[PDB]
Design a binder for these strands. Structure first.
Ligand SMILES: Nc1ccn([C@H]2C[C@H](O)[C@@H](COP(=O)(O)OP(=O)(O)OP(=O)(O)O)O2)c(=O)n1
Ligand SMILES: [Mg+2]
Ligand SMILES: [Mg+2]
Lengths: 363, 983, 358
DNA sequence: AAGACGAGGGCCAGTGCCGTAC
DNA sequence: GCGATACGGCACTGGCCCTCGTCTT
């Protein structure tokens, strides 16, 4: 409950003091900083990869923010439900099939009169009644698995089995914040009620081929708050006894980490073949890895200062270009997980970073 | 009714055989022992019409059964024996299918080698297995060579179809296939995977070698070491189970050459075709050597194992069958997933600890760390050789705007970047591991040029030796350590000296942080060495240890991890959770290779019982198949089954990951498996060997009376009576008893019972000393007990009396030693003589325990064989479909069908009764007790497991997945007779 | 024309029968978007964010609220970027002129009763000194025009107009020829500090950034592009008895599709699943038509995959299960080729990478 | 300029300890 | 005098051998 200063100093959040847990959990926050929206960006991308791309029968859906008939959408489930028939047509009535969409939703909140918005990643899984529960447990285990990685302590993420007011099964996902558990994702099994209500005339356009027979689809639904999730990983990244020596650093997963590497200039001052830093810069961004530029600086200070400055930004590696490297071709490298000086080659550094992220995606 | 336990039997009218003097001795013994408080609880007698006996006794019954079951196979074996051999072909045919080589080794294309019997050895390219690639089989008539469909270069898809070798003939006797480790070859037979069948049985020269001249593993160790006064006499009379060695033993010809390149396991399919002729030649050499070995073994085995029950038993014990489906694949995927997840978490935490501890290198502050000061802490920065010159130092050699006119200056900086890049490469040679990081961290990382490279410090463990000392607090102390043993634990004043001095140069050590850590610990060499915990300064020596081995690392001390001492830090419940994770993946870690690679052939809808298709299950585009366990018929000792995976298969525990492996063998629709576990065999065996030795009746022994007195159902067995002392129920007490029968060593039983009961050593010692009453007593200078009434004498010549050794009172170890004394067969009953390497004639022998265990476990295995042949006899005689066997020593399960399950269970009960009556008859009397005649638990359900109720870990919901339930049995099955017309 | 109908049957747009007109498409009112159009917009936005991340020195991405902070929906994407100016000042260390880019769904009233329309626009607010604001505005003019030019099948279809007024000293507007009527695609204005001096008075001592040992309140450049109108632009730019949409390779939603030819066999599905996983492993969008279920004709299949702007169609026959050869088929040339299945990944990746040029 | 001693890493079998079943 | 019959796993290690480096002729 004191890493907030690290979020203000290094903008993963707003510099406003009024950032209470209520203001963060309601979505009434003034907004996220560049590093924060980048972190959430990589988080949502990691969602999209491990939910939409690898798994077939799942297609993107674009739901509007409002209704043609003022209050906005509370959930982007219904907007996806409106796109059921056409998406049935593009799948040739082959269910199970799902529609996924990551969009901001607007929730009315009575602060004890306002309205708070928050980014939500939703997947609506149209699945036959015969295998509804199986897909529910499936998505439970898989979502919980997706959230239990990227974490330094996966024990904080939990799942709760719960029933509806009528009896419909469902599962909730929690993250153990320092003040208790908090809801981060919800999974429910909707017994084809809303689809039936949306199409009262001809229900024949709702029938989906289960295999040897066309059945009415049961509507599974999973909605994940990525703001509370980004905050969850934000808290999880930060460090707790008899360590005898402490350093301020948040350990975010290399995949979702906002800024991957940090390029600077050492020794210092050296003119004027420093345009090689530009080369390494464009080369790095060409491969799609985030690089912070340490060119125009006021420090000119202890290396511990910008090292801690980079550790507060969860920057994986710190590449240092010096005149000796200008001579031979071996720049410096300081890892975040293990603060240790290491020499390496340039293209070797590029491929090392690419292999680092790519393998980090793996086991 | 009567004689303290008997049932209505027609196994002999006479009979007593009273032995009034012997029963007076027994009664007096049991009175002074003393047990004369009978419960008088008569078990319900069963009146049923027994199956027809062939006379005169049940001995000739089982004998004629075993003979009529193994007669055709013996005929075929004899056909292999008198086989006159045609020479090997000058060249092997490169054609798919079988190739017959008859006159002058001509190539005759054949689909199936129609022969009564043949030797066999299949080949398989491991590079893309496990599909057969080559095979050679010789017959009493001619030669045969089978090539797989891998003769044409394609991009094959292996889903294990019916591609294994075809060997069986169609109807619209009969077969015998011998081979070294024949089960593996059987696994590559096309027609063996079918639900029904089969006539074809198998004979294993390896198992046969084990029966004739086998040796224990302890013997194997010092047998291969040949490269305890008379312990080297059996060295040349026996051999290891290797084909080359067993051939060098039984044939004794020139040494057969083995493939020096190991091409079938080391090479691809490419380099196999390049050396096809040679590999075929080697396979032929193998089947030839195996043929010879078999020829020389069969009569030897027939001599050493004269009773046909062993033969037919070994015949049926080699055709096991495990039916499975897509649920197998799902099981593999889910289990491997869970394993990878838990391992990911563990390695994540450990690599985190290994990352945050790497920071205290700067500056030299690692010496203060009371855990991390033994290792390297190296700082390397190498290297370079000079080529640039000369004589000038190379170590030292805010404007606001908006310019873009230099559009291509970016390609200038790019070109400069590449031109700078290409010049440095010839400076270094080979990429070494990261020198900037300490050595302990280097070793704890994967190599850069490794195909399986993972970021950060990988290879963390659990069970490594660096990481546990890296994080854990140590038993109310500071440091852990290792040298000959890790931190000591589990498995009249005494004093020792102290010493501190300075010389150099050696790694500095710190002894303050330890004492301060102890201070912080109690904030909530001597003294505190016995029961408390502390660490000294230097030494290093024992100074108060109980275990004589050590334990790196503490991996099964959860009760000693969840009770305060010991704990870890940092920190919290991370320790016990880490131990939990280790315990969860303990099984799958040491087995996953054996289960994932556990191949399985799927039979299409073309070749399966259509009556099963008629059954309301398909199931939803589901795949049905099976796998043959691949079991060596007889592995020491005594001729017990040996199988890499299924015999060491874990049970249904909600803790272990792949614990469902046992219950993944699901019966096909319309079919169901019915099995049973003997309760108990070896105990009642030792009991009978006792009472039959002492007198005629079964309850004329102190030990033998308690065995056949307890009932497991709502009661208390002998194991359960020892487990409620207390006492720990129930497997532990079983280990204590069976360990007591084969050598109840005082310290062994000590640390064992103390490990299981968790109390203090003195009271425990009292308990042992009380339980040590059973083995007592026993027998110039000597133990103060002989045949003389008193030991003291003066110049008394009695070297002729010091030849008798025997314990007294409760137990009957004297009989087991009596079978362990005979220099000839030692086979009761039946009845097979084992090992030219343990037969005391020309052996020291000093292998006593192995031979006592040999006796009792042999009785257990002959029990097994008897059960097999008995079950087979009334399964073919009556209409009981599904005769496929799946046996695990004590337990045995048959793959019956849903409409013939109760009659099959009835067949199991009859079998057990007849076998018990056999063991009773071989020693007398034919009469037998009540609570031992019939089975108590008969499992009847789809998948095979332990208890009828089954929970599990990975699938979490067992019945959640497509499953059923089990049924206890019982007494309700004793109403369905063996006749077809029931209910 | 006959283009709006092949976006309905190929799921670029949402299902409509009356609001399918060009007027309803240009309007924010919808009948949202189809999966193909969504992926096209995501790739377009990705290339947009990529063509501004290469821009030196540093431009920080942000996100603005949609409703009113004091209680309403947003029209432009300027105010939210102006609120985070003083904060990002710390991150740029007040050193030089700097910008803030963001992509968001802004709204606009569309005129019975009147409704509300939505548009996903990409904006870039570039704070730059008054003396070097016009030059940088011309710079962004050229860079944006070239940005639209790169993925364009014709550079003549995109145009750049100049304008000015008393409120904005100089501005530029990027138009696109349809050619049913040139339409607004992007606006590039040069607003003064009046916009920023209205939300922070005072004491305005924070606003002025350092500019070479100089304190000066920065002039505000307003970049505002439309990705929906751009999507439609490239859709009309790709439309060419044949009816094939030749979208840019780096822009095309689905770039490859693989089916089977031999009668429905499990092994074919195994191989196809293999190629599926392999192609998805290297970030290549692949349409699975091997499901399938019938695989009726080849010509109408090719027509479908050409109306979906698929770069290459892959056919896995039975010969592939022998020689590994596979039936490739291009879109821009429609050349029925054959190549080994192992060298397909490298080919597609090299082909996409070869489209990386300016 | 060629030859010889020395240091580092991979592949190998051997050994100690742990893990399961009966 | 004594747990017994197996079955495998991983961590660690001394040793053979190729490769690169580097001193030496
Ligand atoms: N640690 C062990 C376990 C078993 N056995 C032997 C003795 C047995 O008689 C035989 C069968 O093992 P069981 O586990 O079945 O022992 P029980 O027959 O006594 O148990 P139960 O009554 O449940 O059948 O294996 C052994 O020697 N050592
Ligand atoms: Mg038993
Ligand atoms: Mg048993």
């Amino acid at each position: 409950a004191l890493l907030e200063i690290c979020q203000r100093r290094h903008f993963l959040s707003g510099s406003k003091q009024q950032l209470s847990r209520d203001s963060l959990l309601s979505g009434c926050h003034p907004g996220f900083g560049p590093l924060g929206v980048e972190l959430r960006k990589n988080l949502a991308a990691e969602w999209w990869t491990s939910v939409v791309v690898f798994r077939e029968q799942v297609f993107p859906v674009d739901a509007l923010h409002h209704k043609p008939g003022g209050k906005l959408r509370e959930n982007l489930l219904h907007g996806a439900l409106e796109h059921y028939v056409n998406c049935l047509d593009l799948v040739n009535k082959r269910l199970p099939y799902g529609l996924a969409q990551i969009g901001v939703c607007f929730h009315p909140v009575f602060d004890t009169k306002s309205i708070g918005e928050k980014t939500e990643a939703s997947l609506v899984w149209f699945t036959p009644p015969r295998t509804s529960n199986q897909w529910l447990d499936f998505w439970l285990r898989h979502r919980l698995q997706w959230w239990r990685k990227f974490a330094m302590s996966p024990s904080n993420f939990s799942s709760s089995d719960c029933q509806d007011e009528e009896g419909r099964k469902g599962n909730k996902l929690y993250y153990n914040f320092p003040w208790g558990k908090e809801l981060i994702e919800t999974l429910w099994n909707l017994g084809d009620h809303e689809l039936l209500h949306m199409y009262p005339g001809n229900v024949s356009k709702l029938h989906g081929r289960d295999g040897r027979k066309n059945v009415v689809p049961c509507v599974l639904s999973v909605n994940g708050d990525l703001d509370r999730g980004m905050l969850a990983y934000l808290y999880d990244s930060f460090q707790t006894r008899k360590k005898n020596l402490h350093r301020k650093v948040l350990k975010l997963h290399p995949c979702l980490a906002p800024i991957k590497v940090a390029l600077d200039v050492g020794r210092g001052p050296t003119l004027e073949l420093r345009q090689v830093c530009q080369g390494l810069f464009n080369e790095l961004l060409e491969n799609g890895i985030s690089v912070w530029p340490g060119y125009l600086e006021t420090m000119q200070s202890s290396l511990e200062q910008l090292y801690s400055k980079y550790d507060e930004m969860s920057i994986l590696f710190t590449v240092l270009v010096t005149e000796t490297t200008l001579e031979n071709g071996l720049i410096h490298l300081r890892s975040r997980d293990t603060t240790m000086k290491e020499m390496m080659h340039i293209s070797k550094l590029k491929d090392f970073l690419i292999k680092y992220i790519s393998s980090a995606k793996n086991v | 009714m009567l004689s303290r336990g008997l049932h209505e039997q027609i196994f002999g009218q006479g009979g007593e055989m009273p032995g009034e003097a012997a029963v007076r001795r027994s009664v007096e013994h049991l009175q002074k022992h003393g047990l004369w408080g009978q419960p008088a609880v008569p078990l319900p007698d069963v009146e049923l019409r027994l199956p027809p006996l062939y006379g005169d006794n049940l001995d000739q019954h089982f004998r004629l059964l075993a003979q009529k079951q193994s007669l055709p196979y013996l005929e075929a074996a004899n056909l292999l024996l008198q086989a006159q051999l045609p020479p090997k072909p000058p060249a092997w045919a490169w054609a798919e299918g079988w190739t017959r080589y008859g006159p002058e080794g001509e190539a005759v294309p054949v689909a199936i080698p129609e022969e009564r019997a043949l030797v066999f050895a299949v080949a398989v390219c491991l590079a893309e297995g496990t599909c057969p690639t080559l095979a050679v089989a010789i017959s009493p008539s001619a030669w045969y060579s089978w090539c797989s469909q891998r003769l044409v270069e394609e991009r094959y898809s292996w889903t294990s179809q019916l591609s294994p070798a075809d060997l069986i003939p169609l109807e619209v006797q009969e077969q015998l296939v011998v081979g070294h480790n024949v089960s593996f070859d059987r696994a590559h037979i096309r027609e063996q995977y079918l639900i029904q069948g089969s006539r074809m049985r198998f004979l294993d020269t390896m198992s046969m070698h084990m029966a004739i001249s086998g040796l224990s593993s302890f013997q194997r160790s010092l047998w291969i070491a040949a490269k305890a006064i008379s312990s080297w006499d059996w060295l040349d009379i026996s051999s290891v189970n290797s084909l080359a060695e067993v051939h060098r033993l039984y044939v004794g010809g020139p040494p057969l050459e083995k493939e020096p390149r190991e091409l079938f396991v080391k090479g691809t399919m490419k380099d196999i075709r390049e050396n096809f002729q040679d590999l075929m030649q080697y396979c032929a050499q193998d089947v030839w050597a195996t043929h010879e070995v078999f020829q020389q073994q069969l009569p030897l085995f027939l001599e050493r194992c004269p009773h046909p029950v062993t033969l037919a038993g070994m015949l049926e014990m080699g055709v096991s069958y495990l039916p499975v489906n897509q649920n197998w694949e799902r099981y593999l995927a889910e289990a491997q997933g869970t394993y990878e997840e838990l391992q990911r978490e563990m390695k994540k935490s450990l690599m985190d600890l290994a990352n945050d501890a790497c920071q205290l290198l700067s500056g030299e502050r690692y010496k203060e760390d009371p855990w991390l000061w033994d290792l390297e802490w190296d700082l390397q920065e190498f290297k370079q050789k000079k080529a640039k010159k000369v004589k000038k130092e190379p170590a030292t050699a805010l404007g606001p705007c908006s310019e873009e006119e230099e559009f291509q200056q970016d390609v200038m900086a790019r070109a400069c970047l590449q031109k700078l890049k290409g010049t440095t490469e010839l400076l270094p040679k080979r990429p070494q591991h990261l020198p900037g990081h300490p050595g302990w961290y280097r070793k704890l990382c994967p190599r850069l040029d490794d195909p399986a490279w993972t970021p950060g410090p990988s290879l963390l463990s659990l069970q490594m030796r660096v990481t546990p000392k890296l994080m854990a607090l140590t038993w109310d102390g500071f440091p852990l350590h290792y040298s000959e043993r890790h931190g000591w634990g589990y498995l009249n004043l005494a004093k020792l000296p102290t010493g501190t001095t300075l010389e150099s140069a050696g790694v500095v050590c710190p002894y303050r942080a330890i004492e301060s850590l102890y201070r912080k610990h109690c904030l909530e060499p001597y003294n505190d060495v016995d029961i408390p915990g502390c660490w000294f300064f230097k030494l290093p020596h024992k100074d108060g240890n109980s275990c004589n081995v050590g334990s790196p690392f503490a991996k099964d001390f959860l009760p000693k991890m969840e009770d305060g001492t010991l704990q870890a830090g940092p920190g919290g419940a991370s320790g016990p959770r880490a131990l939990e994770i280790n315990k969860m993946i303990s099984f799958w870690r040491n087995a996953h290779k054996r289960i994932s690679s556990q191949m399985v052939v799927w039979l299409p809808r073309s070749a399966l019982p259509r009556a099963v298709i008629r059954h309301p299950d398909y199931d939803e585009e589901g795949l049905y198949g099976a796998i043959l366990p691949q079991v060596v018929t007889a592995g020491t000792i005594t001729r017990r089954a040996v199988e890499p995976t299924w015999l060491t298969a874990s049970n249904a525990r909600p803790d272990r990951v792949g614990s469902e492996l046992k219950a993944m063998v699901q019966a096909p629709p319309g079919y169901t498996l019915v099995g049973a576990d003997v309760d108990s065999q070896e105990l009642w065996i030792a009991a009978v060997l006792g009472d039959a030795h002492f007198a005629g009746m079964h309850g004329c022994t102190a030990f033998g009376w308690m065995t056949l007195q307890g009932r497991k159902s709502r009661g208390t067995d002998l194991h359960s009576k020892t487990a409620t002392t207390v006492g720990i129920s129930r497997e532990h007490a079983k280990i204590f008893n069976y360990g007591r029968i084969y050598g109840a060593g005082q310290p062994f039983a000590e640390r064992l019972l103390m490990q299981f009961n968790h109390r203090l050593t003195q009271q425990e010692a009292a308990e042992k000393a009380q339980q040590m009453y059973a083995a007592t007593k026993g027998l110039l200078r000597k133990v103060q007990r002989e045949t003389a009434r008193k030991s003291q004498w003066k110049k008394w010549e009695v070297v002729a009396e010091r030849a008798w050794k025997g314990g007294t009172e409760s137990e009957m170890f004297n009989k087991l030693e009596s079978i362990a004394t005979s220099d000839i067969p030692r086979t009761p009953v039946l009845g097979c003589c084992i090992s030219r390497a343990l037969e005391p004639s020309a052996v020291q022998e000093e292998f006593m325990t192995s031979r006592v265990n040999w006796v009792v476990q042999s009785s257990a295995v002959d029990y097994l064989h008897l059960m097999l042949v008995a079950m087979k006899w009334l399964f073919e005689e009556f209409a009981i479909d599904g005769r496929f066997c799946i046996s695990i020593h004590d337990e045995v399960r048959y793959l019956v069908r849903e409409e013939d399950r109760y009659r099959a269970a009835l067949a199991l009960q009859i079998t057990n009764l007849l076998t018990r009556c056999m063991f009773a008859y071989k020693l007398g009397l034919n009469d037998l007790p009540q609570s031992v005649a019939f089975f108590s638990a008969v499992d009847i359900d789809r998948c095979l497991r332990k208890e009828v109720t089954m929970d599990c870990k990975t699938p979490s919901n067992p019945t959640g997945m497509e499953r059923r339930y089990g049924i206890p049995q019982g007494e309700a099955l004793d109403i369905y007779q063996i006749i077809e017309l029931t209910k």
